[PDB]
RNA sequence: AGGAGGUGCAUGGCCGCCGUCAGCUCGUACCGUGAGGCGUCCACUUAAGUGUGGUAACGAGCGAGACCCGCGCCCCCAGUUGCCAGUCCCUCCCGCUCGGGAGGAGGCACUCUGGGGGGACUGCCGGCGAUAAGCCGGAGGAAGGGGCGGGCGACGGUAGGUCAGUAUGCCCCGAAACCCCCGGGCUACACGCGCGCUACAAUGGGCGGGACAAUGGGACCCGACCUCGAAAGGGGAAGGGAAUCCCCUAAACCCGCCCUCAGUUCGGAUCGCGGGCUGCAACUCGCCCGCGUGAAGCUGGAAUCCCUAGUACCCGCGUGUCAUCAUCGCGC
């Protein structure tokens, strides 16, 4: 089963199937990703799911675009959609929207364009 | 501001006064009717007109 | 298992200490007198710096497949000071990794695809993934969860 | 490099326009079009009166047929002259007309109102005329006359209203004329009809 | 001896097509046109504001 | 097995649209297969220039934009089909480039 | 790297950071109980629309707020005892991982010095650093005069957290002593109403002045 | 003829500001002898001369808004954009032979892209508001109270600036005030001064590895890739006139380790040598590579600017001028 999730410019395509429990981002294990803070948010959603479903399926997600943290956000975003699609269980959906509404909603924030008069510093950054 | 534009307020009077029987409190029902009964090509003003004719109907039966 | 299943920080050191055995790779006479990059201001602190570099280079051949001189130069390039002006990104030197590539090819671990770069031999693949499986069999003990 | 062709043809397109405006100023240079065929380049000139563009026996256009092929380097140009359907709907043509009238020394108010009434009588919906420069003294002045309906800003004003600017010479200097014309056919977004 | 030296580079190399200035000549795929000139002719190019 | 790749460039989306309608309505009349019209990423050209003609005053700039739309249509090699494409009336704004690939 | 993956997996049972589940922590002061967030979270970094709501700071976790206060300490109007407190070198802003690591180490330092949950030490420090009076100018006919004023609890939280961060950053500035040590020491001093906590001292100062401007 | 020769208080357009401001006006009626007044005023609301209710006025025009562009959710169509989606088939590497990974076929899953349409309309509920206009609250929904960000900015003034870009009245020269060339200058210097970069270091400095963009741009061009030089760069050259080739990697961040707080293991100005690069030539008047060199500065009084959500801060990249040259301007 496929699932998509966008963030900033990060886009994540996840495929999940019956399996041991291995979770692979870009073909790399979920447990040895060097950014620890990003690893925590990557591993946040499935914790509420329970180890049964953690060990009942295998998940592989490929991300591209944005930064590492945007990539982690997109990965978690797509993860929640994929897993709730597999279960089709309302109770877990309630658990997610209790913990975080963006799990099945997403953050539509995007960068504002920079404007003249010191364009580099930002849309709202001006001289003295 | 959310003040309804003047010429929408004007144009909504005639649809009421000419087909009072063809409109109800339902927004979607009135939406198609105002879509056909005019030549509006902007969907946004179409929604505005539908909203105000809906409000006009809603205040009709009240008195 | 594969290199993808282990951290690179430990794997590069393991590969460096393993390749230190084979005499195909050797720092030339000018090696201890040249810093590791144009973007770098100071000489390497350690003297094993040569054998890590190859241990890095070969690693990318396992990942990025056929890659030539200039893209590798770009990857190792870094941020350098420019006086009062802010820092800027520059490219690593050429010969430093070029001779490393020649040494790796002569060792038979890698081969060349002209017009595209250099790819990794099945011998090099088997060597790297044997090191990786050694490391993973190790790591599964200190970290049980990697058994999954 | 297709983008190196699009703007190339474009910028060529208006160089001839300005050249003709320099040349056919007296005949009411109205508008230009160009179409490409294997035979060559067919140029279509809408003018207020093709009689003067013809000149005498077509000699004038013959001259125009030469330099166009040489100055602009267009392959086998063939020139076709046509009359503007309603010059009173063309802001550029009316602007040139009024500038010419002032260039005859006619009183500015008189010419302005006469031209305005003429254009409105031709079925236009709204006309604006602005005259700038030395009109009655050493210090410059700006005067406006408007009639009918005319949106001035926003997208519709950019598309529905014809604009035209003209420069008129005199002994005392130059005078600028802005002309805006709203043809009868156009409809504003604000206009809603009932059936 | 009264001919200007051909200049392949420098500001003297380029020249605005319309008004004949040596100043800022924009060359987005080669217009060869002055900055002041571009404003009066952009809508005629088909360019549009957004 | 031989196909014709056709690329149509147009600044006007609609001038493109009716020409695409012409070439697509050629297909079913000719009874020759036709892969759907592929819309390439529309190419945007941006140019910015300061409004002031002189140096004085604040800084204000104008950003002009050219959107040129690119579309691809790939069709089979049918002599009767391709004989009717040069008879298509094309507007001046639109341009057509055809390659014949195997 | 064993500590890294360890700390990664140990909070698998829903724990703040890596350790110190918050059921033990207790809010003694009645005022900040309905305003301090103690919900169970693994990673305290929402990126959420807390800014875009009137009271979106109620739902932000306390440690997240602490990291946020640490985020923005260098270079401004304030010159504590004639010091342009400025982080030219690798400023914490736009780098949340660095502050995350620093507060991680500060939590450990608090824990081993106190031998208890660092989070409860933070709660006590904030409770003991919160001012109770301020002043404001009120006029009538143009004659200004200062008037004593009470403070809304959320503002008390804000100023207490910012003052703790201020003291930590000032202490580490220009000094051999690292930043995490400065922060942990500031927290410890604040927890027990020690007058050398910059936060607690400034709390005493603001609670004065208003004392005499009633 | 020409003049970057004067005249912007001789002009035209064009630009800055007033000001994205809520404003400016007319037809008719009415009041006043008259300059003029009413409309355009009064209570509430608006982002608003936006509307609501009262008025000696009724309508209209310009402006506002509507208009148009990009983003955010969904439906359809579209496939040389994407994929062990699933994928039998073939090959290779590891291994505990279970399984793990890569390449070709493969079809459209899905991404991406561009055409059409829906979705958000105070839409519904509660309160406030006179029961009007409208406001607040609540639900649901990707998105609510002009959804968000933009473009379009009047009547008039600023004798503001622009005639040194164009056109341009008057006046001056007209072998000069016209044209071409050489050389220098347009940098020169005790400083007052606006706006920027760096430093004043634990945050750091140094060594390896790990995860990350898009704007764009590319034919006397982007150039992979091969070879050599520590490098600047040099010889060759695939692909590409552009979803197909290249610029191309991110940096900020973390991981394992060394230096451990000092004007110094910070900082590099300044100074010499050699080497490299563009241009005919770069002392005046370019950049880079290595060595030696190490300047002040250890937080800066008065004063004062900016910002309100992907916003401020930090970090880098593309792009105009360009053969090189930015701490330059615009954009990502």
List the main descriptive attributes of the protein structure presented here.
part of a larger assembly; 7 chains; A: 128 residues; alpha+beta; 4 helices; 5 strands; 39% helix; C: 148 residues; mainly alpha; two-stranded antiparallel ribbon; 11% strand; globular; RNA-binding; translation; dimerization; anti-association; Small ribosomal subunit protein uS9; Small ribosomal subunit protein eS17
Count of separate DSSP helical elements of chain C: 5
Separation of the first and last Cα atoms of chain C: 12 Å
Shape of chain C: globular
Question: What about the largest sheet of chain C?
Answer: 2 strands, antiparallel
PDB class: translation
Keywords: Pyrococcus furiosus, ribosomal subunit, dimerization, anti-association, ribosome-associated protein, translation
Entry title: PF30S-PF30S dimer mediated by aRDF from P. furiosus (Structure I)
Chain A: Small ribosomal subunit protein uS9
What's the helix and strand layout?
This is part of a larger assembly, with seven protein chains of seven kinds.
Chain A: E1 2-7, E2 10-18, E3 23-25, E4 28-29, H1 36-49, H2 51-56, E5 57-64, H3 68-87, H4 90-99
Parallel strand pairs in A: 3-5
Antiparallel strand pairs in A: 1-2, 2-5, 3-4
Helix pairs in contact in A: 1-3
Chain D: H1 3-23, E1 29-37, E2 40-47, H2 50-54, H3 59-71, E3 77-83, H4 91-103, H5 108-121, E4 126-133, E5 141-148, H6 154-160, E6 162-169, E7 174-182
Parallel strand pairs in D: 2-3
Antiparallel strand pairs in D: 1-2, 4-5, 4-7, 6-7
Helix pairs in contact in D: 4-5
Chain E: E1 25-26, E2 33-34, H1 35-45
The structure holds one RNA strand of 332 nucleotides.
PDB class: translation
Keywords: Pyrococcus furiosus, ribosomal subunit, dimerization, anti-association, ribosome-associated protein, translation
Entry title: PF30S-PF30S dimer mediated by aRDF from P. furiosus (Structure I)
Structure in words:
This is part of a larger assembly, with seven protein chains of seven kinds. By secondary structure, chain A is α+β, with helices and mostly antiparallel strands. Chain A is built from four helices and five strands; from the N terminus they run ββββααβαα. In chain A, helix 1 runs parallel beside helix 3 (68-87). Chain A is elongated, with a radius of gyration of 17 Å. The relative contact order of chain B is 0.21. In chain G, strands 1-2 form a two-stranded antiparallel ribbon. The radius of gyration of chain G is 18 Å and the shape is globular. Chain G has 214 residues and is mostly helical. In chain G, 43% of the residues lie in helices and 7% in strands. The chains are: A alpha+beta (128), B mainly alpha (63), C mainly alpha (148), D alpha+beta (195), E alpha+beta (50), F alpha+beta (102), G mainly alpha (214). The interface between E and F is medium-sized, with 14 and 12 residues. Chain C binds one RNA strand of 332 nucleotides through helix 1, helix 2, helix 3, strand 2 and helix 4.
